[PDB]
Symmetry: D3
Subunit: 324 residues, 6 copies
């Protein structure tokens, strides 16, 4: 009966709520990253036979969380350029790296594209080839990835994904043709959440493209969203009624809002005001706290599609100006 | 509640219902095509500023039904070969030509891609720029395009679309770099039904790619599909109960099954056995009557997405073999 | 899920959001009507062979927008009196004039009933016989009537409907048995939106019955209504992201709230507090701006059905009191 | 999700499933009717102060099942002819007699109209004014379909059908009604009631039976998981020991069994996409209907059936009949 | 579409809306209870052939509203003790007493359990064996919420609540039952009934009231558009002239008005995402409740509430209470 | 929407479809169980202070798949008898062992009840305490447990669950009050499928109670079930369109139909004819191949609840007659 709505826009634009994060947030990520950096990155780019004619495609492997071997694609447009800018692409929920030809946009716009495959997913809308590896026993969980290892940040699924994602930018920077002054991190929804994390943790990203981000402002999310991936957390709490405080404590280490406050690189965001998967309150919480130079494209009538192909042109224009 | 099912695969493969067409079907089409040929084609290819680097994008204009000026895109991949193969791409229901960057797949595979905008639509999932023109009065209709002018094949919406589509192949052929002998016609859903009509009506098409085709086997479509575009016809009939014979007479001139019976060019079909928008029994009816060399890729667990990216690979492989 | 709610009643009674119209609102309508008044009304009544026994039914034809010939029914109850009061009845979305026996209420209560057919609709719940005529090209649109010609008030569908509707009152006035001092204009939903326009624009209407009106407070309507006809507008904007400003500019010329502010005749309104098709805030916006003498029947537990048969009795008592 | 469908039309036309009734079917209805006939009909027609002008409206009270007083409307078109034909009108599920102006069709077409109000319902889409009277009111699923279902003697439709038979007798007592030109009419529940009356009353000259409910219960519960028929299923989901008894009871009220007994001319209608009153259930009754018959088939309509188009067909059917 | 939400917890904790009851609320309940006290209780505990081994099961019958015979179960755990505490269990909407094995929790915790069957229901999720007995059964919407709603004297929950008060007396009459530790319990409709009993019974020692239904009817119909509260709204949708009567009738059965008068210790529970019994309705009742009281709040649960976590909470609550 | 239906009862009673299994089905299970038997069972029963007064409750730990430590409850009713019969209870999808008081039925009927916790689940409707331990990498999967490790039977999740279940009987049997001639294995839905496997694989089970069983006749299940856990398989196949043969090859090793053919102990089955989660054709396929002495209770009008409390009485009666 009731159509979805959130704070009106004048309120979203001022929405800077009290952040929740433990005092050891930076230390958790420092130690996480240091432990994973002990295993050699060992990036492998295997040229592959392909029907593509305008783009050269590579099969990628590199070491992410605790040396575990993560797949990707590297798509190189055939241009007369000794160096090229690069977009590192992160993938939406239940997706995976698919085929090289699923990622033609950035190469077609003259960018090398590094597509990071997502550990353990790749079965919902686009196939994937990378397994997850638990940090110990695989605890009781609700179906999906949002509650996997949620009783402890050290065991949580996104600790491993975010580490992979940081390592992904280092791997892309190792490709000789990549212009290390123009490496972009990009993503929509889950991709956007991952990218926000990478924007805070990476030593190599120079700009962020963050669309309709997921993994932002969890306590407000579960209040508004009864479908889709945020509802996995609620469903877990319905059964583990004694685990509320622990669950939100775990999630605080992974929250896009806490990452946005640490991020320094320039960013383009987008938000759909009728998006009931990633509510605009959650998106604006992150955007407003984002500490680098930033703009946001606001799509008042769109749901989780956001700006779609209009936003893609905005991203191209944004980056051309940033890097000219 | 009950999962969508159609006839079993064993039966689908032999499904060949009794066709129905009026005596003047070919004359209706000859006459329509001859009248539109009286206006100069006047194909215009104006290079526009996409931001594409691997492709050059032309804003296309050409004369379709009764000299009405139709929009499109022509995407040329950056390769030297003086005569390149070409895919003429027709668009799904409620879509339009969008941006040039929405159609990068065929260009990236080495093919010039001619994307035809769909008159009067372009407002549902991808934007469009081409108006429709009625013959005269815009008769009472149900919301949508399926019942626009349905009381007479002469006034019927798809008369105009299908004529535009045939003319589109002539426009693609006029581009200097297009190889006249390697022009493919392609589409999914509405695009599939248009391509199927064109496969019978054009003398310039060399091969057909027809995915999960719409506009096929109307009588059975409406018995199975209570949502999406086929339901428009049913809803018109629920009110205009006196018009059953007239409505189905009109639709017989635009039925993919009837065009398939006349089509002689090599084709690759795809079908999803759980497709409840374009039921496998309507697709198989068209496919089993298709008079040219033919194969069909069957996706037994997919809905209207059909083969998705797997099917695109199958199309590339199919055309490479055919052109050797 | 969340059950439908809008502003509470104490807030609804006081709701007068800031109006938006262009500086040429009045001139647009003066020139519209003056252009159509150049064509003779030519009201034509023809007695129908009917099975009806308590009513004389006539087929109606009259000149509406730019002389286009609009169908109607005139139902005269077989009574003593020399002159009778008259109800001009406008029809809901996807309806049409149907059969004479579809409109028995008002004749049975002793009122001549003029039923205006709705151009180009008549295919959803009750048949119609009147075509629409576009100005020129039929622009890209979303399925339905809400976005037909929406990029320009001069081309917008409701320009033609509202003009038809003003001309309908003249047509009714030309039946000699009609008491011109007691011409009422009535409708529900789309009918109520049409009637609201006519209450501002007609010189012959003596009273308004406006039930659960549609075409009111468009900005708020699209926030609250994601099903049904208001969401046609939203779906159009989701795709045509560059046209927001233009779309709402056009709709301002047709919004009941703006007409209500100009209307002087006595009116009875009705509203359902749980109506999620025509939200009570949109109805109250128009009611509260209505500048003639006015009452409103409020139905707290009804959805879009409103007061139904109870409300029909209320209208009978209201008009009787008004005219005594 | 799979879209609703039933048997194809070529099979629906040939669908004559094996009937099931108890051996005391006719005895049950004879005793029921005789028992209720022992109380006086005592029809009361009270002219109302109405806003209507083309129609004289009467508040009706008459004795139905076991002397119980049942409301109604009598609507009389203001015409010359001294004796007028009459349509007895029965109402859809969760409806009631509503207002006089809700029933203008038949008077407008020159027929006196008797609207029988429906005991205990009158709260879903149109209001009613007549209560039910049960005995103990056994455990039931919400609604009217399982009210007293463990015994035909206590079953809710025993009382409705008896009211409906008596309604025809009440209509025939009105002076301006031509007692030899009375018709029985109904849609959905109304159609199921009228089909009972077609078998049980000797007074009606014809049956108008649209998208009839209360037909072929066994089949109806296989196909209908929402709406009134599902009440029966839900009752059986819980009372897993009462299957035989529930269906035994329903056989006394099944339109298929009444159809087999009915001799008067009939115009039926069916929607081939009706998921409320499925076409297999309607055709089962239509195919056993023993009198002269025809069915208007609406292949794309759901439960609305032929709507106004069917109303026209009814006017022409009765016009030819009463010439 | 959108996720369910009510007032945030901070506001819920001080939500005390202005109560509405008629001047004669207490008088209405005294007459009701006195009229029913003129019939003998006549509790019958017939020992059953049961497969149970840790529990002795009785088939119960007692006199509820106006001497009408209400069914029940009594479950006695086999323990070395002569006087045992008791839980009088009331049942959720469309349920009934089912089998004795459906109610093993309280006996397994050492309590005698008196399960009261719910008149005229027992057909939706668990079978029942007890009929309702109304007079005329007025037009109503399908279900129990609008049965006899035009007069508190005829309203269905007059008879259920009287039954429920009388059930406590029947439990107390069982010789093993320790009369100083009689607890009244239920969830949803059960909790609504138990809350009435907490005001009307002189025999109850403690209240267990989970996710209570029958609370704050005005706001309930504003938030709840499916399930039992929506029966009222649908009745009102059609009976547009009866809004005032309907809500006047309802004020006599509203747990908010009972809570205001209840004195015995209570444990409530609430689901903050409960769209069937919204937390605003539950807290209105909790906040007005005049006895010593605690509430378990489950922020992420819907109508299931605390489920098995809550059962634990209850056992501890009563252990600490009776020690 | 079509109400759920399957084959009529006359057909269900004779439904014995052609079985599919690999030639190494027995060898796979023998090797699986032999490897897990190398680890000490080490069944731990800890008296666990509950408020239960008619029942003694024990916290249970035992070695399941590859020595992994599985939780459970042991509920012993306080009776005088020195030996008691035992029901080993397995749990439905997304459940876990919960609290001891969630399982009072069988103890109340004088049976010791051994409730096995379900590895990695315990988060949907009843909480669990036991983690899963993967066979190395956790492959790309669809959310849930149905496709966890589905590309190889050695890695498939239900390999570990079934092994655990077999060992559970060994654990229950080890308890001194348990009469080893009266060890029953029982479950509904997922529990019923687990029990079915255990009836073929346990050498200590004396009787099977098998209600509305899941994990049966996977091919047919996915043709009929589009929501709930069977649809996890379908969604995985929608994306992994090259894995169809491998997926079903893997599932044949865990299919209740194949275990049923090998099970010798007396069984009581139950089935709901309108069960759209575990369709009656899938259940009858298992029952019709079941090789021990067997009966089935058929509930024509029930959905997934089956016989509910009615069936629980049938079970008690069945076991009483069985054990003399």
């Amino acid at each position: 009966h009731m159509a979805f709505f959130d704070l009106p826009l004048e309120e979203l634009k001022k929405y800077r709520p009290e952040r929740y994060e433990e005092k050891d947030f930076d230390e958790f990520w420092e130690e996480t990253l240091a432990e994973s950096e002990k295993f050699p990155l060992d990036p492998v780019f295997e040229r592959m036979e392909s029907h593509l004619k305008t783009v050269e495609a590579y099969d990628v492997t590199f070491s992410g969380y605790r040396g575990q071997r993560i797949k990707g694609w590297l798509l190189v447009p055939k241009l007369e350029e000794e160096k090229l800018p690069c977009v590192v692409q992160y993938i939406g929920y239940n997706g995976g790296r698919g085929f090289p030809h699923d990622w033609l946009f950035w190469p077609s716009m003259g960018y090398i594209c590094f597509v990071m495959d997502t550990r353990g997913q790749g079965s919902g809308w686009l196939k994937g080839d990378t397994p997850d590896y638990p940090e110990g026993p695989v605890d009781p969980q609700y179906p999906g990835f949002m509650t996997r290892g949620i009783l402890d940040p050290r065991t949580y699924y996104y600790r491993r994904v975010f580490t992979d994602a940081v390592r992904a930018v280092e791997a892309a920077a190792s490709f000789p043709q990549v212009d290390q002054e123009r490496i972009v991190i990009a993503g929509g929804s889950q991709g956007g959440g991952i990218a926000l994390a990478v924007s805070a943790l990476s030593k190599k990203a120079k700009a962020l493209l963050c669309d309709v981000p997921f993994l932002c402002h969890f306590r407000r999310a579960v209040q508004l969203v009864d479908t889709h991936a945020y509802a996995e957390i609620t469903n877990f709490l319905k059964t583990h009624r004694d685990k509320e405080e622990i669950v939100f404590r775990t999630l605080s280490y992974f929250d896009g809002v806490n990452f946005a406050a640490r991020a320094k690189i320039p960013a383009l965001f987008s938000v759909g005001l009728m998006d009931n998967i990633c509510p605009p309150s959650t998106v604006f919480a992150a955007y407003n706290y984002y500490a680098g130079p930033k703009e946001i494209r606001i799509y008042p009538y769109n749901n989780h599609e956001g700006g779609g192909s209009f936003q893609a042109v905005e991203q191209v224009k944004f980056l051309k100006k940033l890097f000219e």
